[PDB]
Ligand SMILES: Cc1cc2nc3c(=O)[nH]c(=O)nc-3n(C[C@H](O)[C@H](O)[C@H](O)COP(=O)(O)O)c2cc1C
Ligand code: SF4
Ligand code: SF4
Ligand code: SF4
Ligand code: FES
């Protein structure tokens with residue numbers, strides 16, 4: 001995608017955007033986390049809050065944040081185009097993001113990628129005509145030991161197989177919200193087939209404390 | 214002593230504003246912030 | 257007094273604390289190659305053309321930003337320094353367009369000249385080049401942004417000197433672009449000065465476009481009369497005709513800038 | 520001691536690594552967290568810094584500087600500015616995912632580490648920077664911080680010690696480069712995640728321009744235990760100058776990819792065999808290992824046969840411990856493609872600030888893409904080696920280094936396999 005903005009009827013400075021009263025109270029708390037005189041530090045969390053309210057970042061949403069914090073609009077444009085979690089175009093309701101870096105690739109992230117494409121009938125980077133799904137590849141999501149995995153919106157679905165991902169889309173497409181986490185048999189990052197450690201009960205308070213403390 | 218069940222299922226209920234609501238919640242516990250002495254570097 | 261001793265190729269120099277390695281080399285009369293550094297802007301340290309070897313240290317340092325320490329021997333012509341410059345020049349030219357014949361900077365280009373003096377004499381880049389779309393920022397400054405080398409001089413000048421925060425970088429990595437993001441004009445009474453400080457032909461004078469080359473112009477050092485500041489200028493002429501107006505450095509009047517009316 | 524790698528449960532620190540116990544304050548307190556924390560704070564910063572010094576703890580974020588000496592750079596009289604502790608939870612190095620488990624299963628260890636570490640530095644608050652993708656993990660950590668506030672463990676009179684301390688959580692927005700300590704600081708300040716040159720060093724000019732120490736999540740979380748149990752205990756694990764217990768991620772072509780805590784200096788073979796269930800298809804199916812996240816150069820099966828997992832052992836094998844993210848590849852792996860995809864990762868993460876990475880890393884990516892198909896000549900292998908050397912040591916931050924080292928590993932150990940692809944391609948297209 002591009003890193004220059006061209007006004008369009010859906011996306012121009014007069015596209016209506018404003019924070020709801022509830023989000024203004026949240027904005028106040030975000031801004032209070034930083035030293036007085038350095039309110040520019042609130043740009044990232046407040047752009048994200050704008051995107052969480054709206055789904056994506058119209059140019060008018062960017063200008064509102066620059067106005068609230070009194071930072072030049074350009075300095076908000078630079079942030080919006082730098083960090084990849086900001087959507088400068090409308091996405092689908094369920095933003096499916098498939099990790100394809102080497103650790104996930106080594107565990108057959110391609111099979112997951114093709115499972116979703118045939119299921120939804122789209123290619124990477126596209127949105128379904130019903131505007132429910134958007135498919136994109138992404139770099140390591142920090143869940144490598146549970147590869148292959150995808151992130152849908154705020155949730156991670158891990159240890160996936162082509163069947164498991166096709167099922168998840170069916171639940172989402174059916175109005176249900178599938179449960180995040182590994183889909184194979186384990187709970188998180190433990191070895192599959194039995195823990196190799198942390199089987200004895202953890203020690204209680206005061207165990208091992210060095211003398212004289 | 215139980216060692217065979219996942220005790221971290223609360224995040225199946227987190228929603229869009231969970232993190233920002235907790236931040237708003239903690240607002241009353243923070244100490245007063247330091248001040249650079251001006252409204253911003255542009256003042 | 258409060259001065260400290262450093263060496264440039266073994267020649268002792270007494271510098272004020274905080275003096276950078278680049279500034280120490282000026283005193284002995286050496287100009288370290290540069291692109292991003294400009295003495296009237298904030299230090300950026302991003303082009304990496306100023307990398308120099310400090311004797312006994314295994315890592316080259318960015319002379320434009322590194323404060324010089326006591327007893328340092330700056331080796332400005334060692335193989336480690338020379339190979340650092342050749343490597344950086346190789347990366348600067350990897351995506352640069354083959355534009356010199358049609359580019360107005362040709363003949364007075366820092367990329368050309370520092371390639372001649374400090375770079376290699378050939379290419380080993382065997383791929384295709386980056387190409388970026390051009391930005392319209394008014395009737396004075398033409399942008400051919402494929403020539404931009406991301407030095408960020410224009411951004412720093414616009415923000416610090418002109419007090420206009422309209423230029424920035426959008427994107428990331430190899431696809432990082434300098435511009436306004438939105439369709440905006442950079443119309444400031446000092447805007448034309450980004451033509452001078454842009455080291456390449458990315459920003460050029462729109463009125464001056466295509467009319468002359470620098471070697472053929474005659475330079476007349478004169479005074480501006482568009483206001484009462486008396487800015488010192490150079491009038492470029494060729495075969496009896498005035499071709500352009502350039503600033504002439506005067507620390508006590510205009511420094512190295514002129515207004516857009518003067519220009 | 521001459522052999523390592525049989526760590527007992529009683530000596531493990533992250534005792535809720537798998538989230539099988541309550542991760543909230545009551546559960547953490549029952550496991551020894553937040554125990555006698557007031558006593559530690561009243562012992563003073565010099566005592567705390569002394570304990571960390573003798574423990575031999577080294578940075579668990581990648582570079583592994585001695586932690587005791589790094590934190591001591593803040594032990595200086597206040598010069599009017601606030602002092603800050605920035606905790607690096609960006610956790611971005613591919614193959615690495617240990618900090619994720621500390622955050623969501625043992626947050627109260629991280630919180631107490633911030634307090635104990637903050638006291639040593641004389642810091643008024645800790646900012647925990649966590650990657651934006653980890654939304655649920657951030658919410659857990661944010662819930663734990665609330666409990667610690669409601670129990671008076673942090674805030675005014677933290678732990679009753681008379682020391683005020685805050686714990687703010689700030690979320691990233693998608694950028695591996697924001698794991699670099701100075702790029703992380705710039706990100707908190709609301710700018711692009713572009714690293715700063717040094718000097719100034721963060722201890723002098725850091726976040727908001729104030730004295731700052733950036734510490735990895737694992738580095739911080741072990742400190743309360745090192746103080747409670749003593750640096751002598753921690754230092755009694757692993758080889759000298761490679762002390763303590765370390766979290767390991769084993770991913771890729773192994774039977775049971777998993778995260779596990781183990782003693783430093785354990786043989787790489789033993790770690791894979793004991794905890795991950797061995798290499799898929801047998802130990803004889805092993806092709807190469809990236810020992811410590813994508814940045815570290817790969818090693819071939821011959822070297823992995825006996826290498827120890829610690830900084831100096833892996834440095835000797837021409838690589839590094841990195842974050843201890845062990846990526847195993849078996850003989851069915853297109854090794855050129857595996858490393859090519861890592862270069863493609865670095866191409867997407869470079870901030871673009873400085874020339875050798877902005878231009879050079881994209882250049883190596885184009886060359887690697889051609890090496891996969893063999894659409895190249897053998898003379899280009901040494902050209903690519905020189906290009907990587909032109910990037911390493913000439914950039915602002917170490918991302919440029921982390922892109923060059925994977926390439927050097929491939930050329931170092933798999934040059935004949937690169938030239939085989941060039942032969943096969945040349946035959947077909949004639
Ligand atoms: C590209 C890049 C990414 C990095 N990512 C992380 C990271 O995700 N987590 C981390 O702790 N350190 C990361 N680092 C290292 C930090 O810059 C820094 O060395 C570390 O936070 C220091 O903490 P420590 O001394 O406790 O290990 C990264 C460095 C680079 C160059
Ligand atoms: S900027 Fe310089 S090197 Fe680039 S095309 Fe113009 S004259 Fe040639
Ligand atoms: S347009 Fe010119 S001055 Fe601006 S960043 Fe590019 S090369 Fe530098
Ligand atoms: S090495 Fe790469 S990531 Fe680091 S500052 Fe330079 S361009 Fe940015
Ligand atoms: S490689 Fe996919 S989560 Fe790390």
Ligand code: FES
Pocket residue numbers: 289290291292293300301302303304305306307318319320321
């Ligand atoms: S002149 Fe020093 S890095 Fe550009």
Ligand SMILES: [K+]
Pocket residue numbers: 361450451452453454455456457458459460
């Ligand atoms: K120019």
